[PDB]
Structures are given as structure tokens and as C-alpha cells.
Amino acid sequence: LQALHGYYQRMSADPDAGMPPYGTSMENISFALVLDAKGTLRGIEDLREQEGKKLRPRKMLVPIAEKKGNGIKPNFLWENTSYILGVDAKGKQERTDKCHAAFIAHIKAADQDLAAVLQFLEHGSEEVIGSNIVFRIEGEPGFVHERPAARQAWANCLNRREQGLCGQCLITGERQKPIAQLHPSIKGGRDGVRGAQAVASIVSFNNTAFESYGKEQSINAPVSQEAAFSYVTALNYLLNPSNRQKVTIADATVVFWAERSSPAEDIFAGMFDPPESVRFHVLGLSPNAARLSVRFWEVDTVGHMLDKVGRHYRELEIIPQFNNEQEFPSLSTLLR
């Protein structure tokens, strides 16, 4: 929906809104490695946080990640132990060795920091196993991936990849835009769409029965790459529980947005305990096994659901016995 694209375009213009800049996304990180400028590792920083229930990682803004199928794709500068330490618990060592080789190779595409980390890669507690890690120079603020030269290299890589075919973008209607062969994933589970696969998508053409006119893969529906990135990031942001714009009803998760959300947020009680910018887009979607489907879609104002609730309550009207009774009983009281 172009509405998500517009929402991202608008809100990203606000520096403090929390929109990840182009080409970056927020991920889970557990530890950071500290090595001197000479290329020798010493010092480990653990950023995991105790959430009361459990010790869980922390959210960090990093370059976006590839959608890893069965193939090997190396991430730019942050990875898990298998790619970095060449070690794992999967037993198949050669796979880890190939991952490590690809990871080191991708780097080469002059900075002293990357020179040092390259030097450490000449050799490359247990909890680090399987977690995501980042690199920091001894006594250096920030992180290596945050240095401007790294950003220039990342932009250069992006320019390298975005080449070749061009066509008309359906969301914008413009001509001669590079078309995306694959779309970035969407978070599922506890902090995303509830009950869906770890990574899900809206558009996918994995089976032959779904193809037409001899097209294939995502090219079956053309959209410019940056446009694909935009709405995916916006959807991921809205799904974040920290922002109070998400609620679960029945099986479908509901998301809404406007320039203000406190009143609509009260729909929480609308089911838990029954009683210039666009205003109250409402989207409700339900999960398939590994792909998502749209349940309903409204753009009305007020947020009224009286159509059913109003009827439901007016059917229950009766004069009370005492004068101190309450007009609107909760379902819990009625059931009890």
C-alpha cells in the first residue's frame, strides 16, 4: 500500500522520530568485541540486558541483513560466530569455513580500523556462540561500522548491486526504475506478527502455479528497490511493541496510525474490558504458515465500532433494581 510509503517518507523527515536511515535497520545484538589498532583482540563488551523474565539482547541500528535461504550470503560488518569465529555447533565445519572465507572476502571491496580487523582475521564465555556481535576499537567511541568510511563503502556496495534491468514502478508510476528481485523480510513472533514464521513476507512467488506470462520471482510484480525498503521498514517500526500503536484482537494483529494515537489506543479496553496528517488508517492482517494476508482495511474517522457493540449493548438494556447499579457490565462479570 502506498499509504505506508507516504507515511515513511513523511516521518523519516523528522530526525528524532526513530526512522532508520536508508540502508539500515534495527536488530538484536548481544556482545561487542574490543581489539587494539594493531589487530589483536582484547576485551569483550556484553550489552545484553536482564528483562526481569530473562537476559535478552539489546536493539541496535546496523546495516540491513540479507534474506538467507540455503545459500551462503555474508553480512557486511556484523554477524554471528559461524561467519566470524569459524566455529559453531552444527558439526559441519566446512560450511563454517566457507562462511568465514566469504565474510573475509566481502570486506576487501584502506582505513586503519578495517586494516586492523583484517589483521585480526588472520586468526579470528560460551554464550557468544550463536549470538550477534559487533566490533569496537580499543578505547574508541561508537563502533567501526559507524565510521564514515564504512558508510561510504556500504553506499558503494549498494550502488554496485543496483544495476541492470529497469522498468516502471507501480507504486510511484515512474519509468526506468531498477526493479527488486527480492523483498526484505518482516519480523514475526513475539515482537512482530503473532503466530507467524520467523521471517514472513507479503509478496512471494515461490511456486510455479502462481506465475504468469512467463515471469518469475518478484519480477512478477515490479517495484523500485528503495520503495520496497521504505514500506517494509515502516511496517517493522509500527510492529514494535515499545511504540503504543499495536494491539491484538482475536487472531488478527491490528495496527493504526495518525498524528496522535492516545484515544485509539483505548480500543485496548474496547476488547480487554468492554465499556496536517492522515487520521486513523486501520489495518488488520492475519498470518498464514509463512506468509501474511489482509483481513480488513478501513480509513474511517472516530474509530466507532458501535455497529456491533452499539447493537450488542442496546439488546441488553433493562431497568435496574437498585439505584446504585452500573449500566455497562463487563463480559467477565456476566460470565461469572
Binding site: 508510476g173 502455479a209 489482509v294
Partner: protein, 220 residues
């Protein structure tokens, strides 16, 4: 003068959006390509072309949901020679494992439209061919209720009832409103190896006027 007015209505319809194809979701109104498709179902020959001009919407918009079981893949080409020379069964096993796929859908529930179009001569047409003759044949067929095949509202399981008009367009629900729809599909270019085209759609006074799909500047 020239061109025809035709009326069509039914109970179900589904014009799937290209980008939500696996989980079907329908446009708000019939795109020109479907109108192209329906007209050719009554009369068409290689020597002529259909040109769509306008569409009228006469009912409000409504939605509903349906879910069904479906198949995952198509069938392969056989070799007749070897097949018979050694008896071997051929088939596709629907119930087996991943072959079964379940797909949801959302679709319109009550429709009615009026279509305005006119003919045009194909290059390969013979010299004897005249557009007026085919137009008269079309009018005869429409009045008689005759057709090459039953029309459909996007999918074969949605038959459409139709009629020919000889009067003025009646008023409609959104005759006094203007509403935006965004970009939508215009038509497919078969010459450019089946490449699609798009245009910006705005509904006002319940009438739509897409640009000409044959125009070269549209092809750009």
C-alpha cells in the same frame, strides 16, 4: 454516431491486484483489461480491435472473504511415443503432501456497470472488411442474447448477466462525489514480451476516462 453502450451485472466479482496475487485482493472497480476481455467474448475477429472509452459505476462498494483449497504446480508435457510403447500411468496427486495449498480471498459482492467502446481496423484486415458490418453483427448478437461463450467477471466461476442499452445513463450512487484510487493496471503489451502498463485513476461523478492504451506516449 458510433460505439455502443452495454450493461452488465452480477453477484460476485474478483479483479485481483497484481501485487497481492497469492492472497487474492480485488480492485475497487473493473480495470479496462477486463472490459476488453468481456467484449471479445461476444464477437471478435483477427481483423479488428476493441477500444474502451468509459465505465459507469452504479452501486456502492462492498467486500467479503472466502477461503479455499488449491494446487501448487502445473502439469508437465508428455512424450506420446514412449508413453504408449510401454504402458505407464500419468497423473497429478492433489492430496499428496505439499501439493495442497490453501489460499484466502476478498471480493466484491454486488456490481453493475455500463461500458462505452468502439471498433478499429487491424493491419492484417482484408480490404473488404468494414467496421460498420462487424458493429451491426455485434448489435444483432447482443439483442438476440447470442455469444461465443458465457462472459465472466474476472474468474470463470462468476457468470455475468448483460444487456444492451438504447437510452441515457441513469444516475449512480457517487454521482455527486469525487474519489481517488491511485495507480492501477491499464493493459498488457504482448509485443514487448508481455510487459504491463499503468495509469493514474480518479473516480468522479461515477465515471472513469482512462487514456488510450494504444497511444505511443502511454507505452513509454
Amino acid at each position: 454516431t458510433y460505439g455502443i453502450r452495454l450493461r452488465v451485472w452480477g453477484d460476485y466479482a474478483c479483479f485481483t491486484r497484481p501485487e497481492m496475487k497469492v492472497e487474492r485482493v480485488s480492485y475497487d472497480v473493473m480495470p479496462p483489461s477486463a472490459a476488453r476481455g468481456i467484449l471479445e467474448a461476444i464477437h471478435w475477429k483477427p481483423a479488428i480491435r476493441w477500444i474502451v472509452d468509459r465505465i459507469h459505476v452504479l452501486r456502492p462498494i462492498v467486500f467479503d472473504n472466502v477461503r479455499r483449497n488449491e494446487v501448487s504446480s502445473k502439469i508437465p508435457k508428455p512424450n506420446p511415443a514412449t508413453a504408449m510403447r510401454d504402458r505407464k500411468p500419468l497423473y497429478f496427486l492433489v492430496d499428496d503432501g505439499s501439493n495442497r495449498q490453501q489460499r484466502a480471498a476478498t471480493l466484491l459482492r454486488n456490481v453493475d456497470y455500463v461500458i462505452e467502446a468502439h471498433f478499429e481496423l487491424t493491419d492484417k484486415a482484408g480490404a473488404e472488411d468494414n467496421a460498420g458490418k462487424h458493429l451491426d453483427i455485434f448489435r444483432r448478437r447482443a439483442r438476440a442474447g447470442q455469444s461465443f461463450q458465457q462472459p465472466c467477471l474476472g474468474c470463470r466461476e462468476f457468470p455475468a448477466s448483460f444487456e444492451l442499452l438504447e437510452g441515457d445513463v441513469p444516475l449512480s450512487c457517487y454521482a455527486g462525489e469525487k474519489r481517488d484510487l491511485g495507480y492501477m493496471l491499464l493493459d498488457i503489451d504482448f509485443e514487448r514480451d508481455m510487459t504491463p502498463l499503468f495509469f493514474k485513476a480518479v473516480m468522479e461523478d461515477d465515471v472513469i476516462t482512462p487514456p488510450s492504451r494504444t497511444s505511443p506516449e502511454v507505452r513509454a
